[PDB]
Design a protein around this ligand. Sequence first.
Ligand SMILES: CC(=O)O[C@H]1C(=O)[C@@]2(C)[C@H]([C@H](OC(=O)c3ccccc3)[C@]3(O)C[C@H](OC(=O)[C@H](O)[C@@H](NC(=O)c4ccccc4)c4ccccc4)C(C)=C1C3(C)C)[C@]1(OC(C)=O)CO[C@@H]1C[C@@H]2O
Ligand SMILES: Nc1nc2c(ncn2[C@@H]2O[C@H](COP(=O)(O)OP(=O)(O)OP(=O)(O)O)[C@@H](O)[C@H]2O)c(=O)[nH]1
Ligand SMILES: Nc1nc2c(ncn2[C@@H]2O[C@H](COP(=O)(O)OP(=O)(O)OP(=O)(O)O)[C@@H](O)[C@H]2O)c(=O)[nH]1
Ligand SMILES: Nc1nc2c(ncn2[C@@H]2O[C@H](COP(=O)(O)OP(=O)(O)O)[C@@H](O)[C@H]2O)c(=O)[nH]1
Ligand SMILES: Nc1nc2c(ncn2[C@@H]2O[C@H](COP(=O)(O)OP(=O)(O)O)[C@@H](O)[C@H]2O)c(=O)[nH]1
Ligand SMILES: [Mg+2]
Ligand SMILES: [Mg+2]
Lengths: 113, 430, 430, 432, 432
Amino acid sequence: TNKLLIKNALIHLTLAGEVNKKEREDVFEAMKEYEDTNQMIILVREVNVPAFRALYVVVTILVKKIIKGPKFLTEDVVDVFCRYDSGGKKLSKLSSRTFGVTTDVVVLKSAAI
Amino acid sequence: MREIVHIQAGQCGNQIGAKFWEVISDEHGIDPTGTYHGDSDLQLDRISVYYNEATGGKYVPRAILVDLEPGTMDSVRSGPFGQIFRPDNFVFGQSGAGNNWAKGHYTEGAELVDSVLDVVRKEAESCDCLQGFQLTHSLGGGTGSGMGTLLISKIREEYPDRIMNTFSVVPSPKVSDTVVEPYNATLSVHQLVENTDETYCIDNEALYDICFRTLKLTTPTYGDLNHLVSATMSGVTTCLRFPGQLNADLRKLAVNMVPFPRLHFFMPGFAPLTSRGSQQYRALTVPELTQQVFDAKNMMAACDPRHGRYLTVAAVFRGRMSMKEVDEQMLNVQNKNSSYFVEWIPNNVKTAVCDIPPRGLKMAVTFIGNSTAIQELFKRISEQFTAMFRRKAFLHWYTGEGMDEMEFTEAESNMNDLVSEYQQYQDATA
Amino acid sequence: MREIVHIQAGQCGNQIGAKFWEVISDEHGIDPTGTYHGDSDLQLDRISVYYNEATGGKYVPRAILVDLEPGTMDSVRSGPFGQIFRPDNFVFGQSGAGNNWAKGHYTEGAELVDSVLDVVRKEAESCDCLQGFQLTHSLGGGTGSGMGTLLISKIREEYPDRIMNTFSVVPSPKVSDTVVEPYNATLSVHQLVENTDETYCIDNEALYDICFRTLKLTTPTYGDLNHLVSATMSGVTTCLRFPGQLNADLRKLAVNMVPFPRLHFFMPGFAPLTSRGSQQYRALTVPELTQQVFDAKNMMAACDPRHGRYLTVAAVFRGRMSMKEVDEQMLNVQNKNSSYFVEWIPNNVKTAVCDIPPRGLKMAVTFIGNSTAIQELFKRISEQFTAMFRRKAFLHWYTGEGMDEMEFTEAESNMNDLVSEYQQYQDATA
Amino acid sequence: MRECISIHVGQAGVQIGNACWELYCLEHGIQPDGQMPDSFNTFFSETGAGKHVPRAVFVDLEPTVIDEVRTGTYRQLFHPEQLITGKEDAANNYARGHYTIGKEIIDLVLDRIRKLADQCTGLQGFLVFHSFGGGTGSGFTSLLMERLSVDYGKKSKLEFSIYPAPQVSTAVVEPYNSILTTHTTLEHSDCAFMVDNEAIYDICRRNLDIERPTYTNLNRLISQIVSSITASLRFDGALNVDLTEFQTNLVPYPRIHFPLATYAPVISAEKAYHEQLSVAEITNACFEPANQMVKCDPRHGKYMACCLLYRGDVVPKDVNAAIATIKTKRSIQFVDWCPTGFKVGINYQPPTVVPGGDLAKVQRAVCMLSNTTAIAEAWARLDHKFDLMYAKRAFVHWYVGEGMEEGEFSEAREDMAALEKDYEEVGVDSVE
Amino acid sequence: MRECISIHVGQAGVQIGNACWELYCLEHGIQPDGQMPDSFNTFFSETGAGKHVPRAVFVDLEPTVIDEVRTGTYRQLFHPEQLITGKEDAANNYARGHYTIGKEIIDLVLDRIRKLADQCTGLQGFLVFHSFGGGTGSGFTSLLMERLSVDYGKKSKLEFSIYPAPQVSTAVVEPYNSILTTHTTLEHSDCAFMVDNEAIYDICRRNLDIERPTYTNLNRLISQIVSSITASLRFDGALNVDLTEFQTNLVPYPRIHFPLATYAPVISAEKAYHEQLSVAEITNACFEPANQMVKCDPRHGKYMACCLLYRGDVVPKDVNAAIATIKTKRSIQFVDWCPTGFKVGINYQPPTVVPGGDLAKVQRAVCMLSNTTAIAEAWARLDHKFDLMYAKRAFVHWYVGEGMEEGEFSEAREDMAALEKDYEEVGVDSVE
Ligand SMILES: CC(=O)O[C@H]1C(=O)[C@@]2(C)[C@H]([C@H](OC(=O)c3ccccc3)[C@]3(O)C[C@H](OC(=O)[C@H](O)[C@@H](NC(=O)c4ccccc4)c4ccccc4)C(C)=C1C3(C)C)[C@]1(OC(C)=O)CO[C@@H]1C[C@@H]2O
Ligand SMILES: Nc1nc2c(ncn2[C@@H]2O[C@H](COP(=O)(O)OP(=O)(O)OP(=O)(O)O)[C@@H](O)[C@H]2O)c(=O)[nH]1
Ligand SMILES: Nc1nc2c(ncn2[C@@H]2O[C@H](COP(=O)(O)OP(=O)(O)OP(=O)(O)O)[C@@H](O)[C@H]2O)c(=O)[nH]1
Ligand SMILES: Nc1nc2c(ncn2[C@@H]2O[C@H](COP(=O)(O)OP(=O)(O)O)[C@@H](O)[C@H]2O)c(=O)[nH]1
Ligand SMILES: Nc1nc2c(ncn2[C@@H]2O[C@H](COP(=O)(O)OP(=O)(O)O)[C@@H](O)[C@H]2O)c(=O)[nH]1
Ligand SMILES: [Mg+2]
Ligand SMILES: [Mg+2]
C-alpha cells in the first residue's frame, strides 16, 4: 500500500492541530478496519488551501465511499490529481489525468457541486 | 494630516509610553530637547501625525498624561525624554486610586475628568484632520482600568466617528500580581466591548518566554519588555506616516479585521527576534521572517493558537523587499496552516508593505492576529470571577464606594455571552 | 539541491561527526568561522548538499546533534570547528542514559523526542529537494542505540520515501569495552532491519590493525581511528556533489547493492594507505590501488572475507584516471576471486568514478563491500546473547525501565532468522 | 487633432500612471520637465511657451501617493491643479468612497475635467486607471462613470481594471468591493479591461528569469499594453485602429464587454538571442495558457471575438499566413455563430525599451485583446465568495452605517446571477 | 530544407552529444559561440541575427551533467530552454524513469519539441541518443518513443544505443534495464544501433597504440560514426543516401532492426605512414573480427544486409572491384535468400580531424552498418543473465514499489523468446 503517505498527511496538512482533535481521532479507527485495501485517497477542497473533506478508498476500477462527499469518482468531476510530497509537506501535481498507484490528493469541481 | 492624540493612563501605560516616545523620537531623529537631527527628509514629511511643531523648530509629542497619584509622573518628568512633553499636559490628582476600579471610575475618576477632557479639546483643535485616539493602559491595575474606561465612555460620547485603539496589558494565566485582577478586568471588558473598535490585548507570561527562548536573555527588566511592546505599537501606524508600495492606516486595519461588532480582540507578534551572538546563523529572508511568525512561541498573548481558529490575519511588513516573495509566502504559510484557518472567510490574509525599515535592521514583520484562541483567556477570567463571587470576597471595597451587587452579575453574564460567540459563531460552517 | 540532513547521536557518533565536519570544511575550503577560502569554484557548485547558506556568505552545516547529557556537547562546542554549528540544533537532555537501551527509548528518550523532531521538521523545510538522512551512532552504547533507533521509528513514520543510511560502529569480536553490549545491539538490529535502507557496519578490532600494520603507527588514538572512518563517509557522497564521469549517488549505491529487502549490512574499505616514510616504495597506479582493496587486511569490519561469499561489490573510485584501467582491473579481480563471488548474480561489481581526488593525494578508492561474511558477526552476538539470557544476568535494569521479557524472545529468533537467510539464500545455485 | 484624457482613481491607478507617463515621455523625447529637444498632440495640450503638459487627472482621497508624485521624478511635468488630494481615504469601505467622502470632492474633479474637455475639439475617449480591490478604485469610478455618462454619454470610455486574483489577496473585503461596483459600472461602461495580479508573476518568473520582481516591474508590463492600444493615435501605420473602433469590433452585446489583454514577446535580454521572432512564432505565443494575464484556462471556454494590435516591422502577408494556421487547429475553438472574429491592426513603430527595465529590445510586438467565454469561471469565483461571506453577514456593519442599505446586497447578486448565465447563453451554439 | 532534431536522453546520450556537437561545429566552421567567420541548414535553425543554434534537446533527470554543459565550452551555444533539468534521477531503477519522475516533466520535453518541429517543413527524422544502462537511459526513452510515434507516427526514428558489454559491466541491474525497454522500444523504433563499450577498448589499445583511453576518447569514435550517417544530408555527394533510405534497405522484417557500426581507418599518427589506404585495403578491414564494435564473432552467423558509406576521395570503379572480391571469398557467407545485400553511398567530403584527437588526417572513411545474424548470441546472453536473476527474485522489490507489476517480468522475456527464435528463423536457408 501507501499507508504511511496518507496517515502522515492527515495530521500535517489537512487535519492538524488542537482544534480538530475530535475530527481526526474519529477517522483513524474508521479506516482501521480498512487500510488492508491496497490504495486510499483523500479529498481536498482547493489547491489554494489544502483542507480535508473526505477520505476515500480504492478497492480493486471503482472508487468506494467511506468517511462528507460524493460516493463514486470519475475522471470528469475531479479537477487535479496530485501527490503528497514528504519533504516540504506540499502537493506534487502529477501530470497524469487518470488514476494511478501513486496519487492520493484530489480536488473536485464546482461544476460538479 | 490625520493626527493621532496619544492619551496615556495608569502606572503601566505611563511606563510603556515613556518607552514608546523613545522609539518614535529615534525614527524621526528627535533629541531630548525637541529639535531635529534626523537624516531622511521623509521623516519630516509626516511629522504632524504625532508632533505638533512650536516656535524655534521644536516639536512636542501630542500626548496627554493621566494619573491619580503624583508618583509615576514625577518619575517621567525627571526621567529621560521627560522635558520633551508639555508641562500643561501632565494631569494628576492627589488621592491616588490604589488598586480600586470603584475609586478610579466613581470616587476619583468622576471628579477629575474635566481637567483631562479640556486638554483633549485643546488638542482636537490642534488637529488639521482628526484621525483617531490611542490609549495605553492595563486591565490589571486600578487607574488604567478605571480612568481609561471612563474616558472611552466620554470620548465616543464626544467624538463618535473616530477609531479608538486601546492597549490593555492582559493579566497572565499562571502568576497573579494583583489579588483583585478578576475584579479589575471583568468590570473593564464590559466597558471596552461597547466603545472600542480594536483592542491590542497583550499578555505577560508569553512575553517572558520570548525574552528567555528567542532573545536568549537572563534578566528581563520591564525596560526590555515594553521595549518589545513599543516595537509593535509603532509597527501598526508606520504604514500611515511613511510611503509604502501598499499603504494601510488605522482605518484599513479596522475595516478588514472586525467582522462582527464585538469580536475585535487582537493578539500581536513581531519578527525578526535575533540573539546577541546567534544573529549570524539565520538568513534574513522573507520565507524566514514569515515562518518565525506563524508558530506559537512568538505570540505575545499567552494562549495557544492551535487551540481555536484564526478569523482575520494582518501582516504589516516593513523594509524593502519583493512583492512576489510576500505573495508567495502569504500562500505558503496558508497552505500548511489551512487546517487552522476558518472556512467561511476565504482569502483572510491582509497584507501591507512599507518602504522604510526600523532604524538599523533590514526588514521586519509586524503581525496582527485575530483568533478564537482568546476564548480560554476570557474563560479563565470568567472562572476566577465565579469562585470569588460565590464567597463574595473583597466585596466591601466596591459596595462601600458606590456600586451595586447586580452589576457584578451583569458583567458575568455579559462575558459568558461573549465567550459563546467565539463558539456559536465560530464553527457555523455552511 | 538533493540535500542531506546529518543527524548525530550518542557519545561515539558525536565524536565521529566532530571529525567528519573537519573533513567537509577542508574539501570545500571552509574556515573555522564559516566563510569561504577555497580555491576552485567547483567546491561551491553543490555546496547546498550539506549547508544552509546564511547571511554574509557564511555557511552552517545541516547537522542535528542529539545527546542525553551535556558532556560531549560541552566538548564539541568548546572544541575546534565548534562555532560553525547552529546553537538551536544542540538539543540535549539532563539525566543521561548511561548504558541502558531501555532508558534511551522508553524512559528518557521517549520524553524529549519531540524537542528533536521539530528541528528536523525545520530543516526539511529548509531543503530545496530532500534526498536522504545520514545518522551517525554506535550499537554498543546506550544513547546512539536507544535514541537513534527511536528516531528511525519516527522518521520513517514521517519521511517514508527517502533513504536512511546509518553508521553503527559494531563491537569488536575479542575485546569488549561494554559489559552489556550484547543487549544494546540485539535490541537495535531489530530496529534497523525493518527501517533502514543501508547500514555501514564498522568493527573496532579491524581498524586497529590497519593503524598497526598498514599505516605503521604505534599509538592509535580515536582521533586517528575516526579520521580513517571520516575518509569513507565523504567517500560515498563525493560522487553526489562532484562532476564525475560515471556518476553515482546515495540511491544508485542502494538500488544496485541490496538484492533482498533485509540484506543491507555493508563493510567499507579505503585505499591507498601509505606510511609516513614508506610511501616512496609503491607506484600510485590503478592496478596497485585495486589489489590493496580485495585482501582481508584492509577491511574495516573484522570478519574474514574468505569465509562466506560476496553478493555485490561497489568500488567507488576518486580522482582522475583512465576508464580502461578501471574496466580491466574490475575484470581482473573477478578472475582470481572467481570462487569468492556468488553464482546467481552475474556481473556483480558496480563501479563509479569521480573527478576530484581527496585534497593532497592523486587518486583514492572507497570500497563498499557486501557479503555473507557478516553472518558470523551476528553469530557471535546472538551466542553471547544466548548464555547471558539463560542465566538472565543484568535483567532487572531493563524490566524495571518499562520492558517485558517477551521482547528478548522476539529479538532472539529475529537475528537467528537473519543468520539463516545468509545460509538459506546463500548456496541456492541453479 | 484627436485628444483623449486620462483619469487615475485610487492608488493602483496612480502608480500605474507613474509608469505610463514615464513611458510616453520616452517614446517622443519629452523631458521630465515638460520640455523636448506633431502626432503627439493627442495626450499633450502644450503651452504657447515651450512646454508640453499631460492630459491627466490624478484623483485620490489619501494624500500619500500624491505627495510621491509632487516630490517624485515627474514633479515639473504636471499642472498642480490636476493633482487633487483629499482628507482621509475610503479605506476599503465602499460606502466611504461613493457616499461619504468622495461626494465632497466630486465637484472639484468634474470641473477640472470640464476645463480639460474644452481645450481641444477632438475629444476622443476616456482612460480610467483603477483596481477593483480597495475603496477608491471601485468606489469612486462608479460615481465618476455616473457623472460622465450623463454629461457626455455618447463618448467612448475605457477602464483598465486591475482584477482581484484567485490566489493572491491583499484585501479581505476584496469581493465586497467588486460585486458592489459591478451593480453600477456595468450599465455605463464601454470596454472594461481585466489585468490580473497573479498571472503576471508567472510571466515575470518563467519568461524573464526574474525571481524577485517588484510593483515597479509589474506596472511596466501594464504600461506597455496601454501604449499599444493608443499606438495608432500617435504614429502612422499601415492599418490604423481607433478607440472608437474597439467598442464596435469587440462588444457583441450590451453586457459582455470584458476583454483580457495578452502581450508578446516577453523575453529577457539574454534570451533576446537564440530564437528568430517571426510573426508565425509570436502569434502562437499569444494563444497559449503560458501567456495569459487572467488566471483562467483559455482552452476551457471559447473566444468570441479577438484583436491583434501588431506593431514594428511587420509584413502584412505573414499575418495572413499566421492567421490561416490558427483557425484550422484543434485546441483553439471559437464560437460557432461567429464566422471569424479577428481584427488586425499593423502599426509602423517598434516598442521602445525603458532604461533600467526588464524587457529586451525587440522589433515586433502584439497586444492581443480577447473577449472570450472562459472568464465566466473567474466570475463564478466571486459569486462563491459572496455565497459564503454573506450567509453569516460578515463585515456588514462597516457598510450599513455609512449610507448604504443592506437590502441592496440581495439585489446585486441577481446582477451577477444574470451575467453568469449570459456567458453560458452565448457559449452554447444556436442550432437549426 | 531537410531538418532533423536530436534528443539526448540519459548521461551517455548527453556525453556522446557533447562530443558530437563539437564535431558539427568544426565540420562547418561554426564557432562555439554560434558564429562563423547553405548546406548546414539541417541541424542549425539560425537566428535572423548572425547566430546558429542547434536543433537539440538535452533532457536529464539529475542536474549534474547538465551543469557541465551549462558551464562547459559550449555554454553560449545552446538556447537555454532546451536544457531540461529535473530534480532526482531514476537512478538505475526502470520504474523511476517511466512512471515516477519521467511523468513529471514529459510535457516539458514534448511541448519543447512541439516548438521545434514547427520551425521547418522538411522534418526528416529523429536522433535519440541513449544508453541501456541507467534509469534515465532506457527508461525515459521508452516513454518518448511511445509519445512521438503517436504525435508523428509516419516519420523516421533512429536510436544510438550504447550496448551493455558482455564481460565488462558497470552496473548490477544492467540486464534488467534492457529486457524491460525491449518490451517497449521494439514496436516503435525503426533502426536501433548497438555500440559496445568493450569493443572500443580493443580498438583504442591495438589499432591506435593508446594504452590509457578515457570516455573523452571513446566518444570521439562514436562521434565520427554519427557524422558518417548524416554526411550526405550535410554535404554534396555522387551517390547520396538519406535517412528514409536506411530504414528500407536495412529492415528485412518488422522485428529485426538491430545493426552495428564498423569504421575504418582507425589508425594512429605514427602508423599513418607505412601503408597506402586503398579502398580495397580498408574494405577488407571492415570484414575482420578485429574491427567489430560489438564483441561478437561475425564469422559465426551471417550478414543479411550490409551497407557501406564511403566518403572523401573515393573512386567508384575500385568500389565495384572491392565488392567483387568479397562475394567470392570463403569465410564471409551471406544468407541464401538474399541475392546480394549491399548498399553503397559514395560521398565527397573526407572526415575532418579533431584537434587534440586520436585519429590522423586520412583521405577516406567507411561506416559499415551491417544487419547481421551473429547478434543473436548477444541476445542469447541477456536471457541467461535474466533467468538466474529471476529464479531468486533478485532486486524485484525496488521495481514493484515504484509502479510496476511483477507479473510483467514473466512476459517481457516472452517478448525476447520470440525474438531469439526469429534470428534462427531467418538465419536458416529456405530449401526448395
Ligand atoms: C605533503 C603531503 O602530501 O602530505 C600528505 C601525505 O604525506 C600522506 C602520507 C597522508 C597523511 O595521512 C596521515 O598521516 C594519516 C594519519 C592517520 C590516519 C590517516 C592518515 C596526511 O596527514 C593527510 C592528508 O590527506 C588530506 O589532506 C586529505 O584531504 C584527507 N584529509 C584528512 O584526512 C585530514 C587531515 C587532517 C585534518 C583534516 C583532514 C582526506 C582523505 C579522505 C577524505 C577526506 C579527506 C595528506 C594528503 C597529507 C598529510 C598531511 C601528511 C596519507 O593519508 C591520507 C588520508 O591522505 C597516509 O597515506 C596517505 C598518503 C599521503 O601522501
Ligand atoms: N498592478 C498593480 N496593482 C497594484 C499596485 N499597487 C497596488 N495594487 C493593487 O491595488 C489594489 C488595492 O487598491 P487601492 O486603490 O490601493 O485601495 P483604495 O482603498 O481604494 O485606495 P487607497 O486606500 O487610498 O490606497 C490591490 O488589489 C493591489 O494588488 C501596483 O503597483 N500594480
Ligand atoms: N560510450 C560511452 N558510454 C558511457 C559514457 N558515459 C557513460 N557511459 C555508459 O553508460 C552506462 C551507464 O548508464 P547511463 O544511462 O549512462 O546512466 P545515466 O544516463 O546517468 O542514467 P541514470 O543515472 O540512471 O539516471 C555504462 O555502461 C557506462 O559505461 C560515455 O561517455 N561514453
Ligand atoms: N508590560 C508591563 N506591564 C507592567 C508594567 N508596569 C506594570 N505592569 C503591569 O501592570 C499591572 C498592574 O497595573 P498598574 O498599571 O501598575 O496599576 P494602576 O496604576 O492602578 O493602573 C500588572 O499586571 C503589571 O505586571 C510595565 O512597565 N510593563
Ligand atoms: N570509532 C570510535 N568508537 C568510539 C569512539 N568513542 C566511543 N566509541 C565506541 O563506542 C562504544 C561505546 O558507546 P558510546 O557511544 O560511547 O555510548 P552512548 O553514548 O551511550 O551511545 C564503544 O564500542 C567504543 O569503542 C570514537 O571516538 N571512535
Ligand atoms: Mg489605493
Ligand atoms: Mg543519470
